[PDB]
Symmetry: C4
Subunit: 335 residues, 4 copies
């Protein structure tokens, strides 16, 4: 037999980290980091953090307060001075032919940050690494709202720089919730207003998929699974818990998941194991559902699913006008 | 709190751009750009534009009129003459061993342009970057119509050159609609006729997915969602709006989306929010549907979906002949 | 308006081609081409053709007869002798430290050829480039039949050499059908017998998806779409056409698609447009279906789909024994 | 005709192999192999085996006993000493600036080994090469159980080193079953306990998909396919065979597939061809099903699927309390 020993955690390690440079250098750093060969010189996450600082004045000092270093690790150390240098707080080159950003570069930085912040609000880089056509659609909507619809297609100067590493890095920081809260609650001047309109749409019920799946089930289920006593008792509790959270949080309620608020856990599967099991069961059949703690069984869900409930009757005769409209599409009446 | 400031657009930027060279050089440019190492020297979109110019005589002057530059940016500037050169209007090398295209090179250029133009008509590069087996099938159909079916498999000389960047670039230009209109309405000599036969099939109802999803719903839905009053009133309006557009546009009606005609928006979800909600609901159940502006609810759609409508009865007895045919497959009658 | 001119095919072009070398050199070529750096020196398809020649003695002379060149193009020409060399009929290096194949190299060549030939029989490289877990399962079954099950996992020496280009190239050659026919009808000694057992399973009804989808529909459809007169008349014709082809082709009938036999077209959608429309409609609903030439409509298919047919009744009471078995799983009877 | 000859297996081949180095060098090897440029010097599987040895004290001697070599092949031989060296049993460099692992490096090694061992227990690398969001979720659960939830996002130091080759290699070794058994049955100290909690969840019914699909069918199927006599007779046998295996194997029963126990084959499709056909049929319709040896037909399954069975009635009236709860979601009663 193996002895049952296992690798133990050490204490104390410097690992490579990204940085944000100095506030006065934000624009110069951003311009330099538009070039792939420059990005190759630093921790991969650094340019994304610098672009966010450029996007949102005031954000650099907030990151500093959260413990984000000014210095980025270098891709390769420089044994330059008898001493070995592994990091720096400046990312622009000696050849300092300072120029300003073009319009298309600005839109491209918007595109990169749009994907990045979508990943941060949903708590995952999986869709940005992959599921990206929905993301581009949001970006195109933004660009049209800003009267630059062609840029929805053409602002691709950062297309090879995927933000996935920066999504993961920000998602692991203790201040991620506060950062999202600040984005959702700040009244930004244009074009920030239009940028945040898209992030807010994405953030609504983000990381509250148990809540929204249950609500869908309660609104749309047409079968008797809703009536299974342990399910029904949890429906009442869920609606009451939800109402209390809505009263407490008001307009932030749809954002509890996105801001990593501790109350979001009150609407997790573990809080309503039988109802979550029933709703997940229904939702997979409509498009391993039994939750830890649930006493309801799959065989019971199957049997009750075959029985119908009613949500009221609306009249057994169509109006003359609706009958005529039905004839336009080859429908003769109710059956 | 963040102050609410946001990055502002600048005015005035030269960014890198592709080019089309000179009309007299189209074939020589195209031959040179069949080589990957030559393509690496220029903006990625340039060869696709040059291949289109080769495909369609007259297109080069149309692009010029639309503001497409003759000069392409170079991948790397040349500090050659005390002056720094960033672009050129010629893409063939000094070593000018001019040769003609082979048959297989022509078919390969057809393949590249086929994918490219499919992306342009559908308004997206997502399928070409990925969903490509349907595209190859169209290309194989073309090659068979041109009595070269083996080339459907073998014309792969440009297989590593994906047109996705050129789809996006063309899709962002103000003249994209006019370009598609000109392709759909020009009577091309062979082999252009056969090439355009495939593009026309793809362009039919392209970017009119709300229109076609509603039409599918109106033809195929067998439930009472069609009878919900706010839905039914929009069915009548939709059919009448559609008839008016059909009268106005005649044979171009299926191409309004592909040509980016302003009337296409008259058949967008926003124009029929309740009907679009109902049709999207139905279509996802048959294969977030509530549209901005809709008053219909998911719970109402669910309840009405459970009730059947009729599209007429066709007789309760099979003919003797159809009964006999049914016996051939083990069917005993109607039930 | 564009003038309607289009790029015309030229006549006469040498393009690069793969080769098969000389028969006496098959094994030496194969051993040399197990190394990626050697494969990089030649047309990408060459090693796959050489491995097939190694797999199947006699195949080299058949390829020669089909017009396959002995010489492969080189990745890079050699201006070596005042004359420029673009191709060669030998693929092994000057440093001719001739060795024999290992067992694991043989299994790895089997793996590569297994994927390759699956792509050839199905007429597509799309699954091999991508959909590969089903392929590995076939390969593992082969390796177990040959009493080397570990090689199902470990025979990965050619894992980075995907056969997709060679699938496409062979699929475009005029002799592809004859090649598949010869593979399916030759009685191979072991381990060829076991290799071909897997290819035969894959080849069965390959590229006869219209035939098999219709047969599925006729066996499994429980609705009245089968009774629509234009559909029913084509059901009778289809069964009779199919019976005639079965009589004519006997044990080759399931292989007509795989061998590219002209009779396969007799079972294409165009031959039974209404039945194919009905079967495709059914099959998409069970898992753009209207075929060119069909008169049946989607709205008619929808309406008839809602009516049930019967395939006979089997008794309204369970036997005592089957009732008891039903109690073991919580089933109380028929409903 | 081809003669029917086929390539024959040779006997006797040295192929490249990974290694595990020496026990005293495990940590030094692991630290050196955290660097990609060092990993590039050796067989790709070597670092994964070394990381496993670091993870689990005692595992190195078990691998040695199973025939795992100490020496790894080198990516490139060194003609260094008049003699040619192809392998070595040490993987750390001459420049032996020995350091200890950081916390984040430990978590990153946990991440790599988590994916690796998931692939080993499920018997496939396909999901790890691809289907990875479910894997990250397991890793995040682990990291939270170990009070380091940020590492669920940030422990990415080995993110570019996918374990797929090492999954395949271990999966092909004769001792893979014993290795998994030892992992599942050893009582590991923390953090091994928490690591193995995730592997055990994944290993439960791993590679017993026929067993679990049949059990799902027997619990959830609401149609008369269960009553088809050849199916029903196999239901009884299956439940009895399963009960016997449960008695024999007790808490190991869910792990028979994961440990490659010979009894797992007693629950393969071939053992219950008709029931497996029925369950696979049902399962594809609920989300080529006829098994070798089955006499049941798809047309019979279709017909019986249309008839309902009952699993008992539970009362035709809701309690007053459940009626009130139903009113909260717009449900008026049973229908």
């Amino acid at each position: 037999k193996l002895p049952g020993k296992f690798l133990q955690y050490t204490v104390g390690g410097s690992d490579p980290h990204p940085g944000i440079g100095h506030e006065k250098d934000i624009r110069q750093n951003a311009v330099a980091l538009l070039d792939q060969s420059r990005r190759d010189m630093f921790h991969t996450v650094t340019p994304s953090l610098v672009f966010l600082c450029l996007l949102i004045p005031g954000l650099h000092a907030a990151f500093v307060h959260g413990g984000v270093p000014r210095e980025s690790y270098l891709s390769t150390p420089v044994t330059r001075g008898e001493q070995t240098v592994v990091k720096t707080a400046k990312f622009y080159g000696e050849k300092t032919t300072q120029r300003d950003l073009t319009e298309l570069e600005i839109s491209s930085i918007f595109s990169h940050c749009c994907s990045l912040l979508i990943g941060v609000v949903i708590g995952s880089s999986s869709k940005i690494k992959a599921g990206a056509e929905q993301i581009k659609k949001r970006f195109k909507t933004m660009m049209a709202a800003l009267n630059r619809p062609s840029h929805g297609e053409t602002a691709t100067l950062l297309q090879m720089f995927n933000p996935h590493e920066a999504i993961d890095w920000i998602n692991g920081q203790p201040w991620v919730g506060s950062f999202v809260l600040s984005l959702l609650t700040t009244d930004f001047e244009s074009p920030g207003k239009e940028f945040m309109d898209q992030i807010k749409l994405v953030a609504s019920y983000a990381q509250m998929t148990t809540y929204t799946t249950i609500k869908e089930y309660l609104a749309e289920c047409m079968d008797a699974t809703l009536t299974i006593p342990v399910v029904a008792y949890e429906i009442r509790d869920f609606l009451e818990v939800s109402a209390k959270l809505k009263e407490d949080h008001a307009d932030l309620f749809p954002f509890l998941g996105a801001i990593r608020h501790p109350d979001a856990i009150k609407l997790a599967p573990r809080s309503f194991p039988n109802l979550a099991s029933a709703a997940f069961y229904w939702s997979k059949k409509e498009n391993s559902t039994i939750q830890p703690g649930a006493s309801v069984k799959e065989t019971q869900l199957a049997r009750y699913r075959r029985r119908e409930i009613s949500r009221g009757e609306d009249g057994a005769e169509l109006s003359g006008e609706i009958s005529a409209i039905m004839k336009m599409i080859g429908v003769t009446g109710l059956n």
